[PDB]
Chain A
Amino acid sequence: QAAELFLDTVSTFTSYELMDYKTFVTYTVYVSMIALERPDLREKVIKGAEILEVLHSLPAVRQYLFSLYECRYSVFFQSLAVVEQEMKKDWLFAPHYRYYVREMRIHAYSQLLESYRSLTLGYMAEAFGVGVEFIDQELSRFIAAGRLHCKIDKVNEIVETNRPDSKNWQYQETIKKGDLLLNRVQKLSRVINM
Chain B
Amino acid sequence: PGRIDRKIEFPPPNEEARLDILKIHSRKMNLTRGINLRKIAELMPGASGA
Contacts and interface: CB of A to CB of B under 8 A. Distances in A.
Interface residues of A, number: 6
Interface string B20-32: 0000000000111
A10 B33 CA distance: 6
B37 to A, nearest CB: 14
A21 B31 CA distance: 16
Interface in A1-47: 10-14, 21
Contact of B32 (A10, A14, A21): A10
A96 B44 CA distance: 52
A119 to B, nearest CB: 45
Contacts of B33: 10-14, 21
B30 to A, nearest CB: 6
Interface in B9-39: 30-33
Contacts of A13: 33
A101 B31 CA distance: 36
Interface of A: 10-14, 21
10 contacts: A10-B32, A10-B33, A11-B30, A11-B31, A11-B32, A11-B33, A12-B33, A13-B33, A14-B33, A21-B33
